[PDB]
Design an enzyme around this catalytic site. Structure first.
Site, short mmCIF file in Angstrom:
data_model
loop_
_atom_site.label_atom_id
_atom_site.label_comp_id
_atom_site.label_asym_id
_atom_site.label_seq_id
_atom_site.Cartn_x
_atom_site.Cartn_y
_atom_site.Cartn_z
N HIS A 61 54.47 -25.73 -32.77
CA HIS A 61 54.58 -26.02 -31.35
C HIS A 61 55.61 -25.57 -30.46
CE1 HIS A 61 57.92 -28.83 -33.31
NE2 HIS A 61 58.21 -28.85 -32.18
N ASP A 89 51.49 -27.64 -38.36
CA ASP A 89 52.44 -27.16 -37.49
C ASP A 89 53.32 -26.03 -37.88
OD1 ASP A 89 54.09 -27.14 -35.04
OD2 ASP A 89 55.21 -29.06 -35.59
N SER A 116 63.42 -28.33 -33.54
CA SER A 116 62.20 -28.08 -34.04
C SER A 116 62.25 -26.62 -34.60
CB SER A 116 61.10 -28.10 -32.77
OG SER A 116 60.92 -29.55 -32.20
C1 LIG Z 1 63.75 -37.34 -27.55
C2 LIG Z 1 62.61 -36.53 -27.94
N1 LIG Z 1 62.08 -35.84 -28.83
C3 LIG Z 1 61.64 -36.82 -29.64
O1 LIG Z 1 61.24 -37.97 -29.44
C4 LIG Z 1 61.33 -36.18 -31.20
O2 LIG Z 1 61.98 -35.14 -31.54
C5 LIG Z 1 62.00 -35.08 -32.73
C6 LIG Z 1 62.55 -35.84 -33.81
C7 LIG Z 1 62.20 -35.83 -34.96
C8 LIG Z 1 61.78 -34.40 -35.68
CL1 LIG Z 1 61.59 -34.17 -37.25
C9 LIG Z 1 61.32 -33.37 -34.89
C10 LIG Z 1 61.50 -33.75 -33.46
C11 LIG Z 1 61.31 -32.78 -32.41
N2 LIG Z 1 59.72 -32.39 -31.85
C12 LIG Z 1 59.10 -32.78 -30.87
O3 LIG Z 1 59.84 -33.32 -29.91
C13 LIG Z 1 57.67 -32.61 -30.72
C14 LIG Z 1 57.42 -31.57 -29.76
C15 LIG Z 1 55.85 -31.97 -29.49
C16 LIG Z 1 55.96 -33.30 -29.35
N3 LIG Z 1 57.01 -33.85 -30.23
C17 LIG Z 1 57.12 -35.01 -30.83
O4 LIG Z 1 57.76 -35.49 -31.45
C18 LIG Z 1 56.19 -35.91 -30.04
N4 LIG Z 1 57.30 -37.10 -29.57
C19 LIG Z 1 55.31 -36.37 -30.93
C20 LIG Z 1 54.14 -35.43 -31.24
C21 LIG Z 1 53.07 -35.95 -32.26
C22 LIG Z 1 52.44 -37.21 -31.93
C23 LIG Z 1 53.39 -38.45 -31.66
C24 LIG Z 1 54.41 -38.09 -30.52
#
Ligand SMILES: CCNC(=O)COc1ccc(Cl)cc1CNC(=O)[C@@H]1CCCN1C(=O)[C@H](N)C1CCCCC1
Lengths: 276, 11
Positions: A69, A125, A223
């Protein structure tokens, strides 16, 4: 030689919190990393604008592992190609050009898992990046080991602690230097029961329960980074997961989800030996 | 707030 850090294992020095990891083998709320504590940590950097895209890890002198991603995510119109990014290895500071320390590499080819599921739950991913030329290891640059079935079998257990690192957000300010947090692996049922998203076998979740008192989690910017564990058998560091997703950051009753690397190793081997 | 990196890598 993977997994043995020049400034620690090779000198017989322990980092400040590795004991907590080994004792369990029965970035929000993290702390500043020590120099040379995670020599495989890689920063994915965008040329224009110049910005931190994600974390990643060095698994050899020519290959970098990251979350798919980080490169492809249609919902946010994200779809980077080789020429769009630079790989920065050996870093400590988030923003500074660490002259004589870090090494900036160019990408030759990017490989995203064919069955990466961005439409639903970020299943599989994972992505591999081949560097243009090999990187030369140093006290600050050294690859982490990928797990074998036996190591995975023995270490990936609920309660066992892993370590996550990154320059991502501290709250759902970005850190000055690399942050580190040690988190426990959570029981599948609990991971399942904390969300509405359909969890697959290619993932595992980590973090403390609301009653455990301790907290911490990855967040935006983290990420692609590595979730690693130190084997109490051969004293090497192994990457068991890739920072993938969460619903918020460090929310009570919620957990971070990581790509289960071992479950995908066949794809990894295939790609590496197939494409050099 | 990222520091100017060498253009030799940007090319
Ligand atoms: C505050 C904005 N970020 C978040 O909410 C999440 O961030 C975190 C928290 C924990 C972990 Cl292990 C990884 C991440 C970074 N990854 C991300 O932000 C990825 C990018 C694509 C969408 N995404 C998410 O976490 C989305 N919030 C998810 C995607 C899958 C379905 C449910 C929602």
């Amino acid at each position: 030689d993977c997994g043995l850090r020049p400034l620690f294992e090779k000198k017989s020095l322990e980092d400040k919190t590795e004991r907590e990891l080994l004792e369990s083998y029965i970035i929000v709320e993290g702390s500043d990393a020590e120099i040379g504590m995670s020599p495989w940590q890689v920063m994915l950097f965008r040329k224009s604008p110049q910005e931190l895209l994600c974390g990643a890890s060095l698994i050899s002198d020519r290959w970098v592992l990251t979350a798919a991603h980080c490169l492809l995510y249609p919902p946010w119109d994200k779809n980077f190609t080789e020429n769009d990014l630079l790989v920065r290895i050996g870093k400590h500071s988030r923003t500074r050009y660490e002259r004589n320390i870090e090494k900036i590499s160019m990408l030759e080819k990017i490989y995203i898992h064919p069955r990466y599921n961005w439409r639903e739950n970020l299943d599989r991913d994972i992505a591999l990046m081949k560097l243009k030329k090999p990187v030369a290891f140093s006290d600050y640059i050294h690859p982490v080991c990928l797990p074998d079935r036996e190591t995975a079998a023995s270490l990936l257990q609920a309660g066992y602690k892993g370590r996550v690192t990154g320059w991502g957000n501290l709250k759902e300010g970005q850190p000055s230097v690399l942050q580190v947090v040690n988190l426990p692996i959570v029981e599948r049922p609990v991971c399942k029961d904390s969300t509405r998203i359909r969890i697959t076998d290619n993932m595992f979740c980590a973090g403390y329960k609301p009653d455990e008192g301790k907290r911490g989690d990855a967040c935006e910017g983290d990420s692609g980074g590595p979730f690693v564990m130190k084997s109490p058998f051969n004293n090497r560091w192994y990457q068991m997961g890739i920072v993938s997703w969460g619903e918020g950051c460090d929310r009570d009753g919620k957990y971070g989800f990581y790509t289960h690397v071992f479950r995908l190793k066949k794809w990894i081997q295939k790609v590496i030996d197939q494409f050099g | 707030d990222f520091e100017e990196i060498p253009e030799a890598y940007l090319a």
